[PDB]
Design a binder for this molecule. Structure first.
Ligand SMILES: Nc1ccn([C@@H]2O[C@H](COP(=O)(O)O)[C@@H](O)[C@H]2O)c(=O)n1
Ligand SMILES: Nc1ccn([C@@H]2O[C@H](COP(=O)(O)O)[C@@H](O)[C@H]2O)c(=O)n1
Lengths: 310, 309
């Protein structure tokens, strides 16, 4: 119920789906179908709570007018375009280069927060947003004697340009979602229901397109849907659903910058946990990135009188 | 130089590329490795051919298009095979697909008799089957395995294509043996022709893939080295190595020695995965090994040793 508990919980669970994905990714299923099931989980859990809210509550705010309902399409259109850009990018860059260009969403959300959401940021705060992006990048940077030597700056221009466009779309999606939640006095569960309906539709249309690409002659998406699905596979479907509901909560009762701080701190926690479990070699880059990020946290969230005291 | 040392070495190295693949499958494209692996074999064969011509008084080499053009066929089969493999996986989970893979043992068996016209005793036929049964046994999904593959409950297309896949797989191998043994030619010249067409077709595949997206995205040659770790290069060499041994066996041995090596590699991988990846040893592993060890004895044991005390 407090934004900082939800944000902390999102951090805990964003790193859970991180580890559970790799474990489940032990050589058996389709990660094309999970986002569909993950959306279906969110759509049906939101609908449940909407139903329960209508039967429990004297008044439930719900804008049924197509003027406002149709606007929940946009995020899905952005995310569709985003997925094409992501796929396009990876045909110029190795996934590590792509993973590290991903920290640009922190600055692009920053900018669109100001531009689209028209919200005010101090200079100290702007410097924190940048520090966060720099701090996360720092932890990811390829250390000495790393077998996949990514020759820096030596990737094709298309790669760099698309990586940048990817981050702008990623940010735009999140920032537009916040707009939708906060533009209405409506119920969180009704906003979710509309949002995640269009997501289900578009996820589904994607899989139908994929089947169209092979002339519908091969196996259809609905038949294949459950193939290889272990328990761990189902854990991440729920886990991806869970975190997605928290993101919506924060889109309503918080902001994108709290989101990207949660997401960023999850990525650091994952690396810290990977040392004890997957036994990954701890590096100075991890150490440094954490300190930058902890300080980036304080800068942005610390009350401005605490910044100035002894 | 002795077939049984090469076969044993192929077993050792077929399981090496097995582990090294998963370890490296930790950043790259497994679409491009077969291309580099073929290039390695083509250029290592060419090297030894060159060296053989400069070292040897006489080198047997049939340059006539009548016989050179026949080295295309394996590549055409393997191309069709890869389409079938991809098609299959859109009806079945990879485990179901992996376990249907033991049918290549019986399909090589049959085509050995049909295409290569070679003679098998009944004891030998029973060994070929036992091998396929023994490998399947080790793979079978044990109690409390999270991906519960509802047996027999897959689509018909899946089962039918899995079967067709095995026939093509076998046909490719059996036809290769035909090519090696139909000539008195140099191993290195047979490799050079074989692996030239393989390079060409591997390359045409990647060009097709780029055509499928209108050549608008990243081209295969630019992308070729992306994500390539040292580990990645180890399996490229390792996949090249084993492939040269397969050719040796296509010439101076037979497909059945191949599939015994491949099968025993798959068992060794599971045994090694217990100490390294710490996979839980099962009775199915234990049973499959005993079946396979006995399947080995049956096929290779001299028939007087089978009958003594
Ligand atoms: N694999 C995926 C995953 C998501 N998407 C897009 O993202 C949207 C789903 O929303 P989220 O995944 O952001 O919850 C869909 O509208 C879909 O177009 C996709 O096109 N391919
Ligand atoms: N990923 C792969 C690997 C091989 N192949 C096919 O297999 C042939 C290469 O032979 P090997 O890789 O079996 O030595 C090529 O002609 C190619 O058409 C493919 O089409 N896609």
């Amino acid at each position: 119920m407090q934004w900082y508990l939800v944000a902390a919980l999102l951090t805990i669970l964003t790193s859970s789906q991180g580890i559970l994905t790799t474990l489940s990714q032990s050589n058996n299923y389709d990660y094309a179908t999970i986002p569909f099931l993950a959306e279906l989980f969110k759509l049906s859990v939101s609908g449940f709570f909407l139903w329960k809210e209508c039967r429990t509550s004297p008044s439930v705010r719900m804008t049924k007018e197509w003027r406002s309902v149709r606007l929940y399409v946009v995020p899905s259109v952005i995310y569709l375009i985003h997925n094409n850009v992501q796929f396009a990018t990876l045909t110029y860059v190795d996934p590590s280069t792509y993973q590290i260009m991903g920290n640009l969403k922190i600055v692009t959300t920053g900018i669109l927060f100001r531009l689209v959401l028209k919200r005010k940021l101090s200079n100290i705060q702007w410097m924190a947003i940048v520090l966060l992006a720099v701090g996360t990048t720092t932890s990811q940077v390829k250390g000495c004697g790393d077998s996949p030597c990514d020759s820096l700056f030596s990737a094709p221009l298309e790669g760099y340009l698309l990586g940048i466009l990817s981050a702008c779309l990623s940010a735009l999606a999140g920032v537009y979602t916040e707009y939708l939640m906060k533009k209405n006095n409506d119920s969180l569960y009704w906003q979710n229901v509309q949002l995640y309906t269009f997501g289900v539709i578009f996820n589904m249309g994607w899989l139908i397109y994929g089947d169209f690409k092979a002339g519908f002659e091969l196996g259809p998406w609905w038949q294949r849907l459950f193939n290889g699905y272990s328990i761990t596979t189902w854990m991440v479907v729920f886990n991806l659903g869970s975190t997605g509901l928290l993101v919506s909560w924060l889109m309503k009762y918080s902001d994108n910058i709290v989101k990207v701080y949660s997401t960023s701190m999850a990525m650091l926690l994952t690396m810290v946990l990977s040392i004890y479990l997957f036994s990954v070699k701890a590096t100075i880059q991890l150490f440094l990135g954490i300190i930058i990020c902890i300080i980036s946290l304080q800068m942005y969230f610390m009350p401005v009188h605490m910044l100035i005291e002894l």
